[PDB]
Amino acid sequence: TKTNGQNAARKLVRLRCRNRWADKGWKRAHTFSARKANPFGGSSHAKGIVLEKIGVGAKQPNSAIRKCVRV
């Protein structure tokens, strides 16, 4: 249920502002926590230097050695 009053716009504005934070997608865009933890820093690509070649095993039920590098 919700308020319906003609002069209750302030309550409806406050309600939407508080509840928009519950949306994980909306919160991620309006918070800097994701960008600070993002290695690219919000960029589409990033240049780097190969440190070593490593083999990563596929998750169950797959069985493989996915070839990766440390950058």
What residue ranges bind RNA (CB under 7 A)?
1-5, 8, 11, 19, 22-24, 60
5 is a contact residue toward other proteins (CB under 8 A): yes
The answer to whether 53 touches 67, Cβ cutoff 8 Å, is: yes
Residues in 23-52 at the binding interface with other proteins, rule: CB under 8 A: none
- Binding mask of the shown chain, residues 1 to 40, with x at each position contacting Mg ion by CB under 5 A: x---------------------------------------
